[PDB]
Write a protein that binds this DNA or RNA. Structure first.
Ligand SMILES: [Mg+2]
Ligand SMILES: [Zn+2]
Ligand SMILES: [Zn+2]
Ligand SMILES: [Zn+2]
Lengths: 84, 551, 280, 177, 97, 171, 107, 112
DNA sequence: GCTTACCTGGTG
RNA sequence: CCCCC
DNA sequence: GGTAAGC
């Protein structure tokens, strides 16, 4: 049922799993000739490119965190904090 | 992934609805009627018959011929057929449940032995969990041995209200092998309850009554525990091992089905003809035997339906029973492609997270790369190298599905790659791979390493990584698994990488340290007495890769 | 059996521990909401020793000449003597530290001080000293307010749970209870100044790092915590013995132990080999 | 294939498929109580060819507007006029639409949106089924007997006299082609 | 080589969901079936080249889906069916819980 | 009849299209897939309305394949015929067995026996016709038909019609 | 609350649920000799109000099903005279956090 | 108190061996054995007889018997468990599978 | 209170 | 089988 | 060939 932005209660930090999936998903897309939102300063590896897109926070993806009831909180990879 | 484009929408399974087949559904979903024990030989002509082992249910001969569907071996799921049973038979799996249901219902009128008029019954009918509720209703109704016409009214105990007549006495049912025997009440009336007799009163159980017992109006009516129309599984379930033309060994199931068929033809013949009635009971019980023995051939009632060899016939139930079973042996665990195994050896010159991979293995294992403008030139070169030089490739998968075999293709020397094509190239240095040491007792028994293609036939690993694996070099063998997606390889590198496993969350301490030679040498190197002169100091400094260049 | 029983247990996006049916097994993972790889045995000082030595180590009395902070310890030292307004603050500090010692002695009855907790505070202070080249022979630029209120604010940011309601806010207060006991015991005014000899810059860096490290330490929603636990109990079980006989040669002293006792347990065995009351 | 807004209910229950008629027994998919994108319950939208012709015309016009905006970075006459718009917005391969527009432009009783609006107003007071309301706008009837025979559903729903007032008004609104 | 039960357990512990599916599907026995939308059965008589779909005795032809499941599960289900058990696979949730 | 219906199509888009003009290509693939289509369920999906406001929603990226699947929520004009629907149409083909009538996107075919006895086929006429004591039905003539029944035919619906009953026939 | 010495006759035990909404509780004198709630291993169990319960379920987004359960016959459930459905808050000492609260639904 | 004692017992077997397991693991096992109101054995009788999905329970011990009972009582498996997604060859709601990934056309445009 | 029905490590 | 921590 | 939950 989608928890509104102002009411989101999950972690502001990106989970270790969220990150691995994003980098994986984005590398996959890049490797399938998807448009790249970063300037590949001579980069070639779809993972190394995805990491650049992540670091520059230019990945156009959103995580749908599902709570055990079915409701969910959508989180942009832009707003999510990448520490780790 | 099950070959060739389907216009149908692809979805995932969200729910599994378990149930039982109505005999009406078995007929509805059938492709062939099935009526001859004979499997093949059109009189003698090697080709499948209009009776068993299909017209129709699927194919053999790696010849498309799968009835109008006409799809051929890999693509075709088989299609079910049916066999109509001359007399109804109990399903082995439900013999006990049938006993218990008979023990809960009046064997004459089909009513529930207890109802809302009984306080203890009301408590049971309230039970939310169907499994616990049926167990309660049974514990109550089993003892009830009369189908009460009237019972004391909710208000007045002196007065009575009519519930649902009949008033008939119930038997005390005992299981005699695959038979259900009753004892009504001089000495008791002993009689075996017929399948038809049971089926009939099961057909007469109210929806409200069978829904009060664990049952479902739509998906599982109690009457369906009694078999009437048997589904014949298609050839993929019972494959005929062909020993090259005019020599084929049919599955045990194929043989069993033929026995069910033969027993059935027999019964149908006597039933139709001058039924001696004490011959009919034999063919009937034999049919029961085969149908039982086909699903389960490990019944308590000893006779173990043997093969003419003295072997005991593989029951369907037997195929599913764990460790080697369908579930445990094929679904929870699988034998897998993109895998390797050799003797592990130790290497002081490999970084903690590297794995030394023998060339032969590197040239066999193949990661499938998508042709992109970034790799177009590199992949083009590996394709040129072919399947025999190390930085090489084995296959080229086109836009147009089918794969080019670089070891045989007349065009292998040519091949002008195109974006989107997949190049199946050899495993190369720095590819993330899953390395494992059985028994895999920990999360650390499986860790991701970076490939390092090297000579000689052993997987070489860093000495420090020995401890998490619980490996030594007295000939231990280790397993390698190659990830195939840019997505699965990110899972390995970002989650299972050896350096990420340094601190174990089992013991809450690190699970890798300095060992053996290095541990011994580190104490020795670091005593006051130990001094080094320039010559060696320089080689020692030069050995540290990260050294700042400052003496 | 352990693996098959725990398979489906995973940490959800609400820090709750649930199975495949979504039934709550633990309201917060392992009662604290921390990932076991970020846990280290630390010493909860306050718990042990004499009440006298405790008072010596922690009590700061600006209103008493003998028990004030030495003017050598902080610049504020000379003008802080007799400050009633700040004493009310140091009175809170000491009262809480006592309340903490009382509580720790309830939790761990044997007095055992060493418990695995997130954020090795020893190292952070140690590193702050080597970083800022702490002069254990120079007065500190810190204020009592800088310290007292500084630590108080840090506790507000040691977040395991997030929710703008009392259930979640209480659940959060609780999860952090034992960590905060350690934190308060290690960043007391007397300790910070007289033992660590920190500067405002140094102390700030410490609070900052504790916050960051604590956050890194919380479990990640998605952790397959079930299998992990099954394998963590499984692997040591693998190494236990059937026999043992450590009490052989002395009958009328018998114990079940090792693999057999692990079976008795996991099987919730009714007829156990060595039943025994220990009456106090 | 395309799905709808009507939520799937019957489990297995085979397929107890019922016939569709003019006892207003249009499908499950064509019930009076419909559910719109916004989730709200909306009534069935049935169009009289005229209402239908203008809906499609307007829809296609706004599509060319969007297509030209994104490109930066009298019955015999109305017939050719439409084939131009379709050759600009429609996929060409859509013969079904081309056959429809020729039909609709050649069989619409009311040209302008004012006249179409007036029809739609008049027939809405009636409280008849959206199907009967669309048929009363598409089929030109002179007597209540014509109407009531051609549209059998109507039968006891409206008085013969009231129906006749309506058909006199629809005939007056009929466009002089 | 066998990627067995215990091996599956470490991938679970690791949280390598996508790697696990790949190991059991692509790396081993992935298969494609046609499922009827009415009975959740592998009944669909899908003639691919003719684009004909059909589940007779549902009289389907329209409400049909393509699913990717390990061949051993296609086998498991046909085996359970052979024993009068209906393991009906559905592509939507009726319970909503 | 000729209804407006709220509908939704699931479109799976390949990573190559994950650029700025993405919605532009989804709205495009929607019009290709859906517009001009025919189903027994909905009838002919004649024309998609409100192009400016077609709802894309978010699109789930699919596990092992990179593609993203969106459920495109939209609203279109449909034509679904019915038994007992009285339709006006024009005569297209004509034979000794009957005549076929074009009604919007579909054809309704009238049998010789589902037309009054006086209407007799004339092979002679150019084009072949059906004549009676006061009427002529040939190609191009307008007819009011009562649909007797419909058949769903893959990408078209066809129907059998009558002009036997009162108030039906030539117009 | 009926505090009996040896046993309450089955004849008398029938009358127990006969007077709703009033509830009768039977405890043996011997059982009550020691207060089990005072034990080392027994934590503080707190009876939740219908509204407090409503909130607990709301806040964790729970079905009553998904809550950890306490038996009706449970020595502590009997002590508090917990009815079916009633939720109890359990405050225990934790070696991990300081304090930890669980909830149990009386079934 | 039962849970408290069970932990004490579980701990003491592991620890007597010299062995160390972090609390949270034993805590969890003891918790699982306890949330049902009583003591639920890590056996075919215990945990495997719970309200969890058929296919998952059939993966341990009573395989065929479980599936027959599943059929007769018309059980519905919601495929929420790992085992069910493994049998179906689908991504499990585990770790990297505990959430969904979506493209945001809004931001996709902003990045050009 | 006796008889039944389930189970028993990993690879090769 | 014959091999393994 | 060991345990328990059936009758
Ligand atoms: Mg060895
Ligand atoms: Zn086929
Ligand atoms: Zn009766
Ligand atoms: Zn079907």
């Amino acid at each position: 049922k989608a928890i509104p932005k102002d009411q989101r209660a999950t972690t502001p930090y990106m989970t270790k799993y969220e990150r691995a999936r994003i980098l994986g998903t984005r590398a996959l897309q890049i490797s399938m000739n998807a448009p790249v939102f970063v300037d590949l300063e001579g980069e070639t590896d779809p993972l190394r490119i995805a990491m650049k897109e992540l670091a520059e926070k230019k990945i156009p993806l959103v995580i749908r965190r599902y709570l055990p009831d079915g409701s969910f909180e959508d989180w942009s990879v832009e707003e999510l904090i990448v520490d780790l | 992934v099950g070959q060739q484009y389907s216009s149908a929408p692809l979805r995932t399974v969200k729910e599994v609805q378990f149930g039982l087949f109505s005999p009406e559904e078995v007929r509805a979903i059938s492709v062939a009627k099935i009526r001859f024990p004979e499997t093949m030989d059109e009189t003698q002509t090697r080709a499948k018959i209009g009776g068993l082992n299909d017209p129709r249910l699927g194919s053999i001969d790696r010849n498309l011929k799968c009835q109008t569907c006409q799809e051929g071996m890999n693509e075709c799921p088989g299609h079910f057929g049916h066999i109509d049973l001359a007399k109804p038979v109990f399903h082995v799996g439900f013999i006990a449940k049938i006993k218990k249901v008979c023990e809960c219902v009046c064997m004459h009128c089909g009513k529930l032995l207890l109802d809302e008029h009984n306080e203890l019954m009301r408590q049971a009918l309230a039970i939310k969990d169907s499994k616990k509720r049926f167990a309660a209703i049974w514990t109550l109704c089993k003892t009830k041995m009369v189908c009460e016409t009237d019972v004391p009214s909710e208000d007045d105990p002196t007065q009575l209200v009519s519930r649902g007549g009949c008033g008939n006495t119930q038997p005390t049912i005992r299981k005699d092998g695959l038979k259900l025997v009753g004892s009504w009440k001089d000495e008791p009336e002993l009689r075996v309850l017929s399948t038809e007799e049971i089926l009939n009163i099961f057909k007469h159980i109210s929806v409200k009554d069978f829904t009060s017992l664990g049952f479902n109006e739509v998906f599982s009516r109690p009457e369906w525990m009694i078999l009437t129309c048997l589904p014949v599984p298609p050839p993929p379930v019972r494959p005929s091992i062909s020993f090259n033309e005019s020599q084929r060994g049919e599955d045990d199931l194929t043989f069993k089905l033929a026995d069910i068929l033969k027993a059935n033809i027999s019964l149908e013949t006597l039933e139709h003809n001058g039924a001696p009635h004490h011959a009919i009971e034999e063919a009937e019980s034999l049919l029961q035997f085969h149908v039982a023995t086909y699903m389960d051939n490990d019944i308590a009632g000893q006779p173990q339906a043997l093969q003419k060899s003295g072997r005991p016939v593989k029951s369907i139930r037997a195929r599913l029973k764990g460790k080697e079973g369908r579930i445990r042996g094929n679904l929870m665990g699988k034998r897998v492609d993109f895998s390797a195994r050799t003797v592990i050896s130790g290497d002081p010159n490999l970084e903690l997270d590297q794995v030394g991979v023998p060339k032969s293995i590197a040239k066999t294992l193949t990661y499938p790369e998508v042709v992109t403008p970034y790799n177009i030139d590199r992949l083009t070169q590996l394709v040129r190298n072919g399947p025999n030089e190390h930085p090489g490739a084995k296959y080229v998968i086109r836009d147009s599905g089918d794969r080019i075999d670089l070891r045989y293709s007349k065009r292998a020397g040519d091949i002008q790659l195109q974006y989107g094509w997949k190049v199946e190239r050899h495993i190369m240095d720095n590819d993330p791979v899953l390395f494992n040491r059985q028994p895999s007792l920990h999360k650390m028994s499986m860790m991701a390493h970076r490939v390092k293609v090297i000579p000689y036939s052993t997987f070489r690993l860093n000495l420090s990584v020995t401890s998490p694996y619980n490996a030594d070099f007295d000939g231990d063998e280790m397993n390698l698994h190659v990830p195939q997606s840019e997505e699965t390889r990110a899972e390995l590198s970002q989650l299972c990488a050896v350096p990420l496993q340094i601190v174990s969350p089992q013991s809450n301490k690190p699970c890798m340290g300095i060992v053996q030679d290095t541990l011994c040498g580190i104490r020795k190197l670091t005593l006051r007495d130990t001094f080094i002169e320039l010559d060696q100091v320089l080689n020692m400094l030069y050995w540290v890769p990260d050294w700042d260049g400052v003496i | 059996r352990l693996v098959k029983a725990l398979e489906d247990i995973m940490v959800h996006y609400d820090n709750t521990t649930r199975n495949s049916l979504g039934n709550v097994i633990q309201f917060i993972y392992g009662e604290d909401g921390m990932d076991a790889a970020h846990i280290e045995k630390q010493s909860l000082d306050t718990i042990g020793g004499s009440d006298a030595a405790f008072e010596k180590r922690y009590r700061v009395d600006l209103l008493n000449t003998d028990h004030t902070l030495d003017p050598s310890l902080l610049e504020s030292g000379s003008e802080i003597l007799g400050d009633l307004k700040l004493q009310v603050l140091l009175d809170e500090e000491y009262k809480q530290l006592v309340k903490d010692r009382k509580f720790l002695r309830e939790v761990f009855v044997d007095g055992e001080a060493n418990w695995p907790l997130p954020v090795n505070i020893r190292r952070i202070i140690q590193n702050a000293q080597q970083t800022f080249h702490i002069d254990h022979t120079k007065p500190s630029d810190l204020t009592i307010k800088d310290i007292v209120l500084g630590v108080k604010d840090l506790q507000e940011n040691l977040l395991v749970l997030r929710g703008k309601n009392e259930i979640i806010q209480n659940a959060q207060r609780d999860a952090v209870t034992l960590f905060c006991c350690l934190l308060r015991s290690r960043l007391a005014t007397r300790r910070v100044l007289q033992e660590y000899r920190l500067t405002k810059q140094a102390f700030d860096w410490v609070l900052s790092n504790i916050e960051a490290q604590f956050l890194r330490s919380v479990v990640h929603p998605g952790e397959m915590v079930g299998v992990l636990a099954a394998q963590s109990i499984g692997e040591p079980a693998t190494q236990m013995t059937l026999n043992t006989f450590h009490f052989a040669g002395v009958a009328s002293k018998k114990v079940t132990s090792g693999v057999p006792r692990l079976k008795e347990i996991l099987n919730v065995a009714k007829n156990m080999k060595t039943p025994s009351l220990t009456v106090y | 294939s395309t799905s709808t807004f009507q939520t799937r209910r019957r489990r297995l229950k085979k397929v107890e498929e019922e016939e569709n008629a003019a006892t207003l027994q249009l499908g499950q998919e064509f019930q009076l109580k419909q559910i719109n994108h916004q989730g709200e319950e909306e009534e069935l939208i049935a169009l009289n060819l005229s209402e239908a012709r203008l809906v499609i015309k307007e829809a296609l016009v706004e599509r060319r507007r969007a297509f030209k905006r994104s490109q930066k970075k009298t019955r015999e006459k109305e017939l050719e006029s439409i084939d131009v718009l379709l050759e600009q917005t429609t996929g060409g391969n859509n013969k079904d639409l081309k056959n429809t527009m020729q039909y609709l432009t050649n069989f619409s009783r009311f040209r302008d949106q004012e006249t179409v609006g007036a029809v739609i107003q008049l027939l809405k007071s009636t409280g008849l089924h959206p199907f009967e309301v669309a048929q009363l706008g598409s089929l030109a009837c002179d007597t209540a007997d014509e109407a009531k025979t051609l549209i059998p559903s109507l039968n006891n729903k409206i008085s013969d006299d009231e129906l006749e007032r309506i058909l006199k008004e629809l005939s007056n609104l009929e466009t002089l082609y | 080589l066998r990627f067995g039960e215990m091996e599956r357990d470490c991938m679970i512990a690791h949280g390598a969901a996508s790697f696990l599916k790949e190991r059991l599907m692509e790396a081993s026995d992935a298969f494609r079936v046609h499922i009827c939308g009415i009975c959740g059965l592998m009944t669909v008589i899908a003639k691919l080249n003719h684009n004909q779909f059909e589940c007779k005795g549902c009289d389907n032809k329209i409400d049909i889906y393509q699913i990717h499941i390990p061949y051993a599960a296609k086998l498991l289900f046909q085996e359970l069916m052979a024993m009068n058990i209906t393991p009906r696979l559905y592509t939507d949730r009726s319970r909503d819980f | 009849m000729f209804f407006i219906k709220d509908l939704s199509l699931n479109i799976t888009l390949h990573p190559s299209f994950f650029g700025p003009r993405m919605k532009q290509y989804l709205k495009t693939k929607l019009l290709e897939e859906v517009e001009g289509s025919c189903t027994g369920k909905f009838g002919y999906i004649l024309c998609v309305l409100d192009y400016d406001n077609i709802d894309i929603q978010r699109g789930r990226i699919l596990p092992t394949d990179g593609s993203a699947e969106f459920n495109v929520k939209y609203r279109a004009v449909v034509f679904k015929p019915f038994k007992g629907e009285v339709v006006d149409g024009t005569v297209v083909s004509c034979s000794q067995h009957g005549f076929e009538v074009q009604v919007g996107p579909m054809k309704v075919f009238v049998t010789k026996h589902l037309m009054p006895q006086d209407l007799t086929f004339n092979a002679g006429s150019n084009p072949p016709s059906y004549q009676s004591s006061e009427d002529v039905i040939t190609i191009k003539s307008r007819i009011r038909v009562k649909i007797e029944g419909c058949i769903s035919q893959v990408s078209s619906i066809h129907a059998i019609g009558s002009i036997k009953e009162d108030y039906l026939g030539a117009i | 609350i009926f505090v009996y010495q040896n046993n309450i006759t089955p004849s008398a035990m029938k009358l127990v649920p006969s007077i709703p909404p009033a509830t009768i509780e039977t405890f043996n004198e011997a059982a009550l000799v020691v207060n089990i709630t005072h034990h080392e291993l027994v934590p503080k169990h707190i009876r939740l109000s219908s509204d407090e319960k409503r909130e607990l379920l709301k806040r964790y987004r729970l079905k009553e099903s998904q809550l950890p359960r306490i038996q009706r016959a449970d020595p502590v459930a009997l002590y508090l005279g917990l009815k079916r459905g009633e939720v109890v808050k359990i405050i225990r000492k934790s070696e991990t956090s300081g304090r930890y609260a669980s909830y149990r639904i009386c079934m | 108190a039962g849970r408290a004692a069970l932990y004490k017992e579980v701990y003491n077997v592991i620890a007597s061996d010299g062995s160390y397991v972090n609390y949270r693991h034993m805590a969890l096992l003891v918790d699982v054995m306890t949330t049902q109101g009583g003591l639920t054995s890590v056996t075919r009788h215990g945990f495997n007889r719970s309200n969890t999905g058929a296919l998952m329970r059939c993966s341990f011990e009573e395989t065929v018997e479980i599936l027959f009972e599943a059929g007769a009582s018309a059980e519905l498996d919601d495929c929420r468990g790992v085992s069910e997604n493994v049998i179906l060859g689908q991504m499990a709601p585990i770790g990297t599978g505990a959430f969904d990934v979506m493209i945001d056309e809004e931001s996709l445009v902003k990045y050009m």
